[PDB]
Write a protein that binds this ligand. Structure first.
Ligand SMILES: O=c1ccn([C@@H]2O[C@H](COP(=O)(O)OP(=O)(O)O)[C@@H](O)[C@H]2O)c(=O)[nH]1
Ligand SMILES: O=c1ccn([C@@H]2O[C@H](COP(=O)(O)OP(=O)(O)O)[C@@H](O)[C@H]2O)c(=O)[nH]1
Ligand SMILES: O=c1ccn([C@@H]2O[C@H](COP(=O)(O)OP(=O)(O)O)[C@@H](O)[C@H]2O)c(=O)[nH]1
Ligand SMILES: O=c1ccn([C@@H]2O[C@H](COP(=O)(O)OP(=O)(O)O)[C@@H](O)[C@H]2O)c(=O)[nH]1
Ligand SMILES: O=c1ccn([C@@H]2O[C@H](COP(=O)(O)OP(=O)(O)O)[C@@H](O)[C@H]2O)c(=O)[nH]1
Ligand SMILES: O=c1ccn([C@@H]2O[C@H](COP(=O)(O)OP(=O)(O)O)[C@@H](O)[C@H]2O)c(=O)[nH]1
Ligand SMILES: [Mg+2]
Ligand SMILES: [Mg+2]
Ligand SMILES: [Mg+2]
Ligand SMILES: [Mg+2]
Ligand SMILES: [Mg+2]
Ligand SMILES: [Mg+2]
Lengths: 133, 132, 132, 132, 133, 132
């Protein structure tokens, strides 16, 4: 088809705010399927630093990593037609109502969800979170 | 600015149990059902008239088969600026906040039809609700 | 244990825009619409047959007027143990978790009717859906 | 950083029972109620103050009659970028995903007011919450 | 009719958990109307002690008052047919799914909502929260 | 005090897209995920262990074939009185307001498993989360 896989992280603010099912349900309602999933009570800093390696020289890098290890996270591989960009549009941004971030988040850092933004980041990010490839 | 527009609820909505969810978004925008029909299986002729504008397109035949692969509801909706507003509500599979935007992920299986103009609306209402 | 049961969506559901909300609770319990009619105003005769068991009660006449005071939907639902299950879903205005339980607050205006037995179900389905 | 902004829940929200729905959307985006008042009927001079930039418009008197036709809630909300984010949440009747986009369908009866700027905010908050 | 008024408090755990609209909406959907409402960023301890005067000799009294002043609360007079008992049944308990407490709360103390439990408590509680009678 | 309990989301939840709905209800009651695994297909000996008190029943093989017919999620949840409260949330197909009451309508395909006692809990958690 146009069948793809993408990588989603549920960030610690989602657990803190009890928005976990709310976020996953929006992705579920658009007809995407869980293909693999892991729950991390605390994620290894090395996994986070890899995941956000492209950001390693930004001002926010260290606080980002701190936050990403500050509570649980769930990593999920989703599957569906055009999954990468469709789930990316679902994530949206804090300025755009209708999307997960648009409806539920209000901060440039604590923003509930990561979604892969291209085939390249998807393959690489899936590799990081699910090395059992 | 009162208008009537024709909506179809497609078989995939029944398959996935999204019927109420879809009608609900239209209800909450304050549009009123003016008439409504349930079809366990729509007559093929009705579907062919409905998508006649499309009889030449490559997807036509698959499209008719899918429209007949399960139940559909035909609904006449009324309200201010209804045609254009229900069209926006329907949206597309790309932009969230809408019916397709939130619930659909296929170019074919996309849950809902809404008339896109005054002419199509009159025509489509007469196909499904010929007693006018 | 497959059964069919008759549901009415009452005018107050239209007044309060709870139509989709009500059909949704039944849809999510996995029952299937088998046939469905929308009435902008139900024929008084139909309402009188429907509530005939009640023609002697003091509330009868007010009840008929209310049933005719706006739109109703007549729905035939199918599924395992449908009659009894949709009855429980309907509930009463006292116990939350149900349709009336959650959404209604009147002994008269209570949003939904559901057949309460095998006999009433056959009878009511034949009143509203006589083409069987 | 943090801002505060003034929201009014308009009389159409009470009538259509959308009060919790509208407040809920603002609540789920993580804004906090700092101040809130319920007015079964808001005093007309308050409404006229609130809408004073509108005093020369043709809809001015009609808007004010509407705003006084049922209850309103005035709320001061606080959170990061509150003025602008709550404005976007309010949206408009052409923009699905927003409060007005999903729930409203009229130029005038559109459920919610939100301050549109730092200055209108500070002003509107002093109108409804002059204690401070 | 059978038209009554009752008094509802939204407790500080509701604000803390962002359940305020969720709780009010359940009461709204059952067709009850707000007749008066006040938001308290912090409620006067004397109001709480009065409100819970019948409990003044229970073990839990002091922690209850502490909690009731630990964050915002909203006091609301609701109106509707049989409002006192119907809104009481809506409140329910932490053991009963379908109700506010049944669905949303899990603690004998932090339980999101108070509703008046009789005509007597209603009149008295309304008096406490809305002396402007 | 705190307890932990084992929940399984059964294959019918995945098929009917109710996974987030079921988890959401447990989430809104303030229980926390301590451990969680997704099994695209659970190994049959795990399922047979899990249901070993059922090994002599007539439905045993059919239950296990079902449990293996699609994905399951196993979750350890934590909160006050978790075992018993989550059991009540699960409810049954006759009890509106619960997960099975609102969403399920079959004796066997009923969406969710929840440990029913301190002992079955500790046992079921060691079956699905033997690391500990
Ligand atoms: O100023 C910033 C920019 C981003 N981030 C975090 O780093 C992630 C990656 O940043 P990006 O701008 O690419 O956001 P995204 O791709 O996730 O939309 C974001 O999700 C934020 O959580 C941050 O903490 N501060
Ligand atoms: O490549 C396509 C495009 C169209 N459709 C179907 O044909 C309908 C009408 O096509 P159109 O482009 O007008 O879609 P719409 O106006 O409904 O967005 C769509 O809703 C689809 O269900 C399809 O099956 N394949
Ligand atoms: O005092 C009453 C009792 C009944 N009803 C109406 O009559 C219907 C049928 O009465 P019944 O007692 O059988 O109610 P149901 O079986 O639907 O719960 C109810 O749904 C109400 O709408 C009424 O108007 N007043
Ligand atoms: O033709 C109009 C224009 C506006 N309004 C009302 O006046 C308010 C202020 O007008 P404005 O165009 O500034 O709307 P807003 O800024 O709230 O989007 C609107 O929200 C409407 O409720 C109206 O009743 N008729
Ligand atoms: O052991 C207890 C009993 C009750 N309460 C609090 O005191 C209120 C009144 O107690 P009651 O048993 O009457 O509960 P309610 O009437 O509110 O259902 C409750 O809502 C709880 O918040 C408490 O903190 N500990
Ligand atoms: O006749 C039956 C009885 C039970 N079960 C399945 O076996 C599980 C365990 O049975 P039990 O009666 O203990 O159900 P539970 O304790 O989960 O409510 C149920 O949840 C069903 O999924 C079944 O398939 N057929
Ligand atoms: Mg990025
Ligand atoms: Mg078109
Ligand atoms: Mg009866
Ligand atoms: Mg403006
Ligand atoms: Mg008590
Ligand atoms: Mg058991």
């Amino acid at each position: 088809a146009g069948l793809q896989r993408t990588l989603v992280l549920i960030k610690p603010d989602a657990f803190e705010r009890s928005l976990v099912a709310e976020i996953m349900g929006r992705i579920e309602k658009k007809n995407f399927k869980i293909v693999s999933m892991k729950f991390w009570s605390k994620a290894p800093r090395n996994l986070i630093e890899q995941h956000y390696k492209e950001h390693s020289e930004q001002s926010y890098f260290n606080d980002l990593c701190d936050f990403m290890v500050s509570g649980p996270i769930i990593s999920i591989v989703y599957e569906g037609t055009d999954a990468i960009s469709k789930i990316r549009r679902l994530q949206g941004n804090i300025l755009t109502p209708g999307t997960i971030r648009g409806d539920l988040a209000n901060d440039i850092g604590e923003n509930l969800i990561h979604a892969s933004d291209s085939e390249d980041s998807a393959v690489d990010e899936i590799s990081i979170w699910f090395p059992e490839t």
